Each structure stands twice: as C-alpha cells, then as structure tokens.
C-alpha cells in the first residue's frame, strides 16, 4: 500500500533530478508534466489538473462533491492536482483584504469569497490529491515594497492554508499540501518566502509569481537563485510553465513538476509542437505535406494521419482536427518528459538539453 | 478475392431486406448507415462518405489525387461513397444548362463547371468505391411539369454518367455506379425514372429528391410506391435520410442504405440520440445526471462518462464534449443498424419497429 506522500530522488545531473512521488492513488514520475483533464481523454500522464476556478463557478464545488468528487466525475482514478483559485480570480474575474478576495461571477452574478480556509475547503470538496496553498500571485513588474507586502500576505495565507488543511481529517490523511514561494524577481524576498514556507512545512514547494510576463531570460535568472532556497528533498513545482524550451531550462535549474495551457490551447488554435519547433498547421505549406505532425512522435495521430489531412480538417472547420492536434501535443509533451527523465537517469541530460535546443531553434 | 460488386439478400421480412454488398475493399452489411469520415475517427462502419462538394473546393480533386486519393488521405482502407456534387452546389453555392451547372467558389472566387462527365472524373480522382450519377435534386414543392422536365434532364445526365464511368478503365473495373431516381412526389414520374435507370443499368439505385422539406408522412407515402419500382436484386439507397425513426420506416419500405448529417451535426450542437428519443445535453436537467448518455449503449463514451460530465464539458466550451457526443451518436446509429439487421434476419423486425417507436416517442 502506497503512502499518503513520499518523494524519492533516483538520479541527479547538476541541479536536475529525476524520481518518483508515491501517493495513494498512484506514482508520479518526475520531472512531470501535468495536463488539463478536460481538453482530451487523458490515459494513464501520471497526474492531471482540475481547474478550481472554473469548477467553483460551474457547477460549484458542493455540486462536484454531490456527484462523487472529481475522480468519479472525470473518470480518472489517479492523482489530481488543483490550484487554490485566486490566480484566475485576479486574472479573469474583485475586492481584496487580509481575509481573502471577494468577486462576482460573470456566469450568473452570484457572490463568491475566496480565503485560505474556503480555498482549502473547495479543494477538499473537489477531492484533489495535491492541494495548493492559497496565495497572491504578485503582478509583474512590482516594486520591492509591493512585492514584499504581497509576499508577506501570501506567507500569512500559507499558514492559514496549512491549518485549514490539517483540520479536515480525510484531507490531512489522504491528500498533500504544497506551499507557494513568492517574492517577484527579488532574491532577498524569495529567500524570506522560502524560509517562511519551510518553517510551516509542506509536502512540496511551488515557485509562484513567474510566467506572468517577465520573459525567459528573467525567469531563468530568478530560478537560478530561487530553487536552491527550497528544501532539496521535496518536489519543486514551477507554476504556469511552459513552452518546451522553458521546461528544459527549468529542469536544468531543479524543477520537478510543470503545468501549462500551451499544448491544449495551441491544439485548439492550429499550433503543433515538434522537435523542430512549433508549426501552424493551417498554413498553406502543409496542404500537401504527407509527413506526420512530427517524424519521431509515437502518438496515435502520428502513426496514422498526415499533416495534410490534419490541415484539411482544421481548415474545413472540423473539430476532429483540433482534437487530433491536442492529442498529439499532449503526447509530445509526455515524450519530452520521458526523454528528460531517461537522460537525467543516464547522465546525458546536459547533452540532451544542448541537442534539443540546437534542433528546436534551428 | 472479392468481386468489384455483388449484392446478396440473406433474409427478408415484408419489404425489409438484410444482406451484404461485397466490393474489393470490403463487405458492407445492409441495411447500412454510412457516416461522414471527417467528423470523428471512424473505425472498421463498413463504408464512409467523402464530401465531394467540399473536396472539389478544398483542396480540389486533382490535389486529392496527387496526395494518393481519399483512402490514403483519410487513412481508411475500406469502401468510400461519394455524391455527385450538384446537390450542394444548388444548396450552398449558379447557372444551369443541359451541359451542367457553373458556379463560383466562395472560398476564393475560382470558377467551376459541374457536368456528368466532370462529376464522374472528380469522383475518380477522389478514388471512391461507390460513385453517384450526376443528377438534379428537384426542389420541393414542384409542379408536375417542372418535376417531369427536371427528372427527364436527370435521366439524360444518368446516361452521360454511365458512359463517362465506363470510359475510365480503373473506375469501371474497381468501382461501382449508382443511378438516382427522381420525379418529386409523383408516382408516374417515379415510374418513368425507374424505367429509364433500369434500361441504362446501374450497380445500385438511389431514391433521390426526398428529405428536402416534405415531412415524414409524405416521404413514406412516396417510398411506398417508389421503392418497388427499382430492381429488387440491387441495393436501394435513400439519400439524405435521416432521423432514427425515418431509418426504421424506410427499412420497412425496402431501403438498404442511409446517409444523414444528423448524428454528426447534432453532436456538435448538444443533441444526443438515445432509445428514449433525442436529448439536449446542455439542458440544466443533465447537470447532476450520473447515467450515461444512453442506458443500453455499448459505445466507449457510455462505458466511461456520465451525462453530467459531458454536459459540463460542452457548457465549459471544451471541444472534447462535442467529440464525445459525436462518437456516441455515430455508435448509436450503428447499434440501431445492427438491431435492424438482426431483427430482419430473425423474423422479428415488425415487432422491433413497433417496440422502437413506442419507446422512442414515449
Ligand atoms: C500562466 N502563468 C501562470 N503563472 C502562475 C503563477 C501562479 C502563482 O503564483 N500562484 C498560483 N496559485 N497559481 C499560479 C498560476 C495558475 C496555475 C493554474 O492555471 C490553471 O490553468 C489556467 C491550471 O489549472 C488548470 C493551474 O493550476 C494547477 C500561474 N499561471
Ligand atoms: C439532406 N437531404 C438530402 N436530400 C438529398 C437528395 C439528393 C438527391 O436527390 N441527389 C443527390 N445527388 N444528392 C442528394 C442529397 C445529398 C447527399 C449528400 O449530402 C452530403 O452531406 C451534406 C453527403 O455526403 C457527405 C451525401 O453524399 C453521400 C440529399 N440530401
Ligand atoms: Zn504525434
Ligand atoms: Zn454511447
């Protein structure tokens, strides 16, 4: 019988690590990509995401619980990770206070408060296995004073999240809780945030406040000093990242877990990922191209259909085209993660990262 | 090795028949439903449709031929049926003459003529296995004089279609040609059309000019006298039909083959077919319904996911929801055809039709 949570590092190369998270509902191989569950039929990825913000508004967390929780609802018996919901409230919905955030639903005008306690309860009702602390994703750019005030509030909210999670027996005994580091681009604030989170104690640690407009060079610079501040023996989750090259560089800097809307968003908009870079399949140059989306990809789409046919479907308005693109993109991301894990385990990740970049950007 | 074309009737009940069409690329069990190939990944339906009108405009028949034909393009090695293209020209695009029809492409302004000879050549370039004669689908309603003039032109075009098909060796030796009966709702014109088509000689015979606004009672009345006029020993294809109850009643009247945009169109618009009638899954009454789309359906969607989850996906704007609906609808139609074939073979089709209607309309 698997434990509630156990992270083991099997191999390392530089700052990169590969290993496993064991949870009751399954094993997660790291570095891991965690896809959205609703964009395609995901098969046994090791873990999928639930969209807390959307689920709060439709059909509501209480209703999801009445339906048996997300595992039953989505037909997925393996681990599920949910965010704390505030990122999207600030992004898509507001009135803020030390208690939390209040906002109105665009779907029907209903009122909603979101606090550390309510966010944890929502994630409990959804039934997720990895629960995120309720934080504030500081806007970018931010002055040092505003970044500090924001981070300090997030650390108070992290303690309230910890206490709310520990108060619910089923959650404390069966799920895991991750804390989220903030501090914008400032090394001293990132250090204070890491120290506060480690003092509270979490099962895993996320790097928050990135992928919010800063650009890859700046993101990598912040990761260079921020990831070593987190406990080495716990998983590191970079929220909102990212493109394939973002993932490779973040793994080089010690990140273990990733989520990004790109593969599913790109698939609905004609963009396919390949080892030679992204392609927009709607372009006329693909109308007679008999090659698969990617020449090495092992996914079911690339085994059967050509670029020309997928181009045709999308140009004809057939949803089948976008579905095949999305299935290929999710599979490409998982093949990327498998190559990353194998190369770290084999001591050739540095070479893989170099070869990957030379071809992806050629 | 299978013949170019051979239709065998295995069992009969009243006017209903069940049997097989053997062609080089496979066997087709009848009565058959023939789905669009582009709306979902169709698995070995016995035959799928190519959309001649769309393919003529994008990417063009010559280009499809350059890509290897529709079988290679779509990844489908079994039979394909194509229409002659004029129905949609009159429906979606015109200048008519005894030579054919000319029209302009809305996609790019290019000019296109469509004649019996060009329609047959287009279907040859597409590589389809069952080729339809180039006809005129008479508008409804039509006066007797206009229905007669229209039908007479279609019969001249049927002879030109026959001759064009026979002139192309690869087509004549490997494909089959169906003639299309016209005559609107008029028994004497339907008889003249059937006589003309049988004198020319075709591999199968379609009932054209229906599902164009006349309503089920009138359609059934026309089928009552029109189907017995066609050769009994050849397949009968009712073009454009239809809803599940249309199919059952048409089989009762001697039809062997069906095509309809409903299951794929309905699936993209929130309508699912069930043995208790169609349901619109977007309705709020399905938001907490844990039953599958249909309680008896054996499709992969109904084995795994609830009405509540499919409702959620569609309401959230996820294309996955429409894809699952479409896959269920195609599977439902094939389960309907299997029940029809089994019941005719077993001598219980009359009872099946009665039980089907009582429950579908309850
Ligand atoms: C795009 N850039 C990006 N930077 C982010 C930074 C943060 C952060 O500091 N705190 C929190 N709590 N969330 C963040 C998030 C949202 C992730 C969720 O976004 C959701 O997708 C929209 C996804 O869940 C389907 C995921 O939840 C697991 C970020 N997204
Ligand atoms: C909806 N009612 C309906 N009544 C019809 C009557 C006729 C007719 O008299 N002659 C011809 N030639 N075609 C007809 C058609 C079009 C069928 C095609 O319609 C195409 O779907 C749009 C489908 O191919 C993807 C199919 O081709 C196999 C009809 N459709
Ligand atoms: Zn692929
Ligand atoms: Zn089903």
Curated annotation (Swiss-Prot), chains A, B:
Class in the EC hierarchy, top level: transferase
MF term (GO), any: tRNA-guanosine(34) queuine transglycosylase activity
List of residues binding substrate: 83-87, 135, 182, 209
Keyword terms: Glycosyltransferase, Metal-binding, Queuosine biosynthesis, Transferase, tRNA processing, Zinc
Catalytic activity: 7-aminomethyl-7-carbaguanine + guanosine(34) in tRNA = 7-aminomethyl-7-carbaguanosine(34) in tRNA + guanine
Residue numbers binding Zn(2+): 297, 299, 302, 328
Region called RNA binding, residue ranges: 240-246, 264-268
Pathway note: tRNA modification; tRNA-queuosine biosynthesis
GO BP of this protein: queuosine biosynthetic process; tRNA wobble guanine modification; tRNA-guanine transglycosylation
Cofactor note: Binds 1 zinc ion per subunit.
Outcome after substituting residue 259 to N: Abolishes catalytic activity
Result after altering residue 84 to A: Strongly reduces activity
An example Gene Ontology CC term for this record: cytosol
InterPro entries registered for this protein in UniProt: ArchSynthase1/Queuine_TRR, TGT, TGT-like_sf, tRNA_ribo_trans-like
Enzyme Commission no: 2.4.2.29
Essential cofactor(s): Zn(2+)
Active site (catalytic residues): 83 (proton acceptor), 259 (nucleophile)
Keyword Glycosyltransferase: yes
Keyword hit for Cell division: no
Family from the record: Belongs to the queuine tRNA-ribosyltransferase family.
NCBIfam families, A to Z: Q_tRNA_tgt (TIGR00430), tgt_general (TIGR00449)
HAMAP family the record matches: Q_tRNA_Tgt
SUBUNIT field: Homodimer. Within each dimer, one monomer is responsible for RNA recognition and catalysis, while the other monomer binds to the replacement base PreQ1.
Function: Catalyzes the base-exchange of a guanine (G) residue with the queuine precursor 7-aminomethyl-7-deazaguanine (PreQ1) at position 34 (anticodon wobble position) in tRNAs with GU(N) anticodons (tRNA-Asp, -Asn, -His and -Tyr). Catalysis occurs through a double-displacement mechanism. The nucleophile active site attacks the C1' of nucleotide 34 to detach the guanine base from the RNA, forming a covalent enzyme-RNA intermediate. The proton acceptor active site deprotonates the incoming PreQ1, allowing a nucleophilic attack on the C1' of the ribose to form the product.
Protein name: Queuine tRNA-ribosyltransferase
């Amino acid at each position: 019988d698997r434990p509630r949570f156990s992270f083991s590092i099997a191999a390392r190369e530089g700052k990169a690590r590969t290993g496993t998270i064991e949870m009751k509902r399954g094993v997660i191989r790291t570095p891991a990509f965690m896809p959205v569950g609703t964009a395609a039929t995901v098969k046994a990825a090791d873990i999928i995401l639930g969209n807390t913000y959307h689920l709060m508004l439709r059909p509501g967390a209480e209703r999801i619980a009445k339906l048996g929780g997300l595992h039953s609802f989505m037909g997925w018996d393996r681990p599920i990770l949910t965010d704390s919901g505030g990122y999207q409230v600030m992004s898509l919905s507001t009135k803020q206070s030390e208690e939390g955030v209040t906002f109105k639903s665009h779907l029907d005008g209903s009122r909603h408060m979101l606090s550390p306690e309510r966010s944890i309860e929502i994630q409990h009702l959804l039934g997720s296995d990895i629960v995120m602390a309720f934080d504030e994703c500081t806007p970018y750019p931010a002055t040092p004073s505003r970044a500090a005030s924001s981070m300090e509030r997030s650390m108070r909210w992290a303690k309230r999240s910890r206490d709310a999670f520990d108060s619910r027996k089923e959650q404390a005994e069966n799920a895991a809780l991750f804390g989220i580091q903030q501090g914008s681009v400032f090394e001293n604030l990132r250090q204070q945030s890491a120290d506060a989170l480690a003092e509270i104690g979490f099962d895993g640690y996320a790097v928050g406040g990135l992928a919010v407009g800063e650009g890859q060079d700046e993101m990598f610079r912040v990761l260079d000093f921020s990831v070593p501040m987190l406990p080495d023996d716990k998983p590191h989750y970079l929220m909102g990242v990212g493109k394939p090259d973002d993932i490779v560089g973040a793994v080089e800097r010690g990140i273990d877990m990733f989520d990004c809307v790109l593969p599913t968003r790109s698939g609905r908009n004609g963009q396919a990922f390949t080892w030679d870079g992204p392609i927009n399949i709607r372009n006329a140059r693909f109308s007679e191209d008999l090659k698969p989306l990617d020449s090495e990809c092992h996914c079911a789409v690339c085994q059967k259909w050509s670029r020309a046919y997928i181009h045709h479907l999308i140009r004809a308005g057939e949803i089948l085209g976008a579905m095949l693109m999305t299935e290929h993109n999710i599979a490409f991301y998982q093949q990327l993660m498998q190559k990353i894990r194998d190369s770290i385990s084999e001591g050739r990740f540095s070479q893989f990262a170099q070869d990957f970049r030379a071809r992806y950007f050629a």
